[PDB]
Amino acid sequence: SPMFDIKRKTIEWGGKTLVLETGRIARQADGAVLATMGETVVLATAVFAKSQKPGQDFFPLTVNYQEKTFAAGKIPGGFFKREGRPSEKETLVSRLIDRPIRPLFVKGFKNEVQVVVTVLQHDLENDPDILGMVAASAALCLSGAPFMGPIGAARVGWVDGAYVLNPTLDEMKESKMDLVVAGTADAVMMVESEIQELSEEIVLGGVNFAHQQMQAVIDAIIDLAEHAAKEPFAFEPEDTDAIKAKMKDLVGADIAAAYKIQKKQDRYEAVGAAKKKAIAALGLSDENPTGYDPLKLGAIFKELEADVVRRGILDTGLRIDGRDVKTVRPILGEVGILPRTHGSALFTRGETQAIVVATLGTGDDEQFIDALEGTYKESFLLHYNFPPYSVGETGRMGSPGRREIGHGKLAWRALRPMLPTKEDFPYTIRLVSEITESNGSSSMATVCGSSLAMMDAGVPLVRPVSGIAMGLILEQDGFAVLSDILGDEDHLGDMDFKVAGTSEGLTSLQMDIKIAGITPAIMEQALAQAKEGRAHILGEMNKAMDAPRADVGDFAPKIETINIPTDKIREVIGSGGKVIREIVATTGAKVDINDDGVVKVSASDGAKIKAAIDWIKSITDEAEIGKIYDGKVVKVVDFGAFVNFFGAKDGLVHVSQISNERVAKPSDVLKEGQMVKVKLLGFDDRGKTKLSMKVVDQ
């Protein structure tokens, strides 16, 4: 037969069965699994180069997660009805898949590797991202490429108080958590979450739930691999140690009294020293074979700086900037810098400042997110922008990148929780964050600044939110947890992570680990410190807001909202828009529309909005119900009283159902115009309107 599969079908996985087909499709790739989760179907292919590029200084890895529209029987809404440039989600999973992997390629291995995942069937229940991560993983192990150990991934939800594994789309609708996690047999590797205000324990309890729950899949992948993987590709995990130790003793003291250099001068001076000095003494030579070529001899020094700085930080919590592992940097918040803009903020932290500005709009300003789940409309628009001058370089500009997007997402994931409902606040709020200075987590600095810029704009942010960048140097013996890390501190820590939330729990946690050994004990201690830090950064935010501005700036606009009984829709819309257009033209206000009977009315004037609202209510009113109500007597009669729930449509308070006990002649509360409260007994004979006074009550 063509095709000689092969497939681990076994694995029902927390309610759902997972398939892994190989051998049948894309045999021409090195690995190509076809995973299935119920009905959601994705093909993963990994192909990797067998040479290494000549001038090859980094490991070139690329992941392309892509969704074909037909997987959910559609045809793109594109003018070209073919699908092209990658979506937010396309780009965002691709990152999410890439993250946990990159670390896991054998040290030294610098070959071109490209994993492609493609979504072929979406059952509108199982989100393909998690599946896709698994698939990538599978496909890879199968390839024989030097990719250490299959990697699993699990999304966790929060229902009732149960961590639930891989909540389908529906199950998500009712969860207080979207915590995605991927890891190996040994530790988790990455974590990206979105949290509806939960505490460290509940959240990290999440992580560990996921760790176990993927353990089934990791084992599975192996099962498949066992009789299906390609002959593993022989590559000598490069050993540096030999030459690494040799350069250490030529410079290893010259850096201990080099970094120690407080004055930024020789503090680099010794740098260039080492540089020149060593580059010479051993360096492919000139003469003189041993040691290694002046090429790969960089890396060693780079590496070596690490090993030096890092020791120095475990013995004394003394960092490069000379501060203690716990000590956060100087913050300064600042609101309404550049007024006119619906909400503005210049959050700044040591050397990590963002300008952040909010922008209210209408429903016209919502964004159609033509998704596979279901094309839908987002009204929350974080846009993150990281320009080169923000680090003293040149380049780029426009067309935001994969991180520029992942970060603005990371921040958005850390605010969507603390948002007022379209009920309290019926707007669409943009928020671009322009990093003007980076050196610490601009991604965190953005959120903080937004939390600010948004209150300034006039937003019922149910609480304000902080964030801190975090690090983690880790040796077998001891280890440090760095609060508010530098750009450098990241490029050396064995783990780095951003914690975001309020002072009543977490709004988002993102993590990225590089090495195994982060016991749940080390983790909790970590968020512990983060809790301290972030609720401190929060301290400074309040020193510029603490609560929203009462309202918004008159430019821009309201935006006022109300509900109507659903069965009234036609009457306000009218035949083909007849009434609605008339209402909009006249009052000068924008109206729409929904279907749960929700009306949002907008313009610049409160006058036009009231006009519109009051209009609609006239078409909408009449109910009764009854339902007590207020009103005024219109006329009184030795007979009873006529009064007004408003809308002329009066009612009668029968001379009988007035005040109880005795009334002789209804001159009891006889005052033409005197306001009272009344309940409608019901429009008694004929289309009449009985109604009396138990005010109060039943």
């Binding site: 192990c141 299959p150 009789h227």
Partner: peptide, 8 residues
């Protein structure tokens, strides 16, 4: 006989 393996 089992295949292996980088996983391993």
């Amino acid at each position: 006989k089992p295949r292996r393996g980088w996983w391993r």
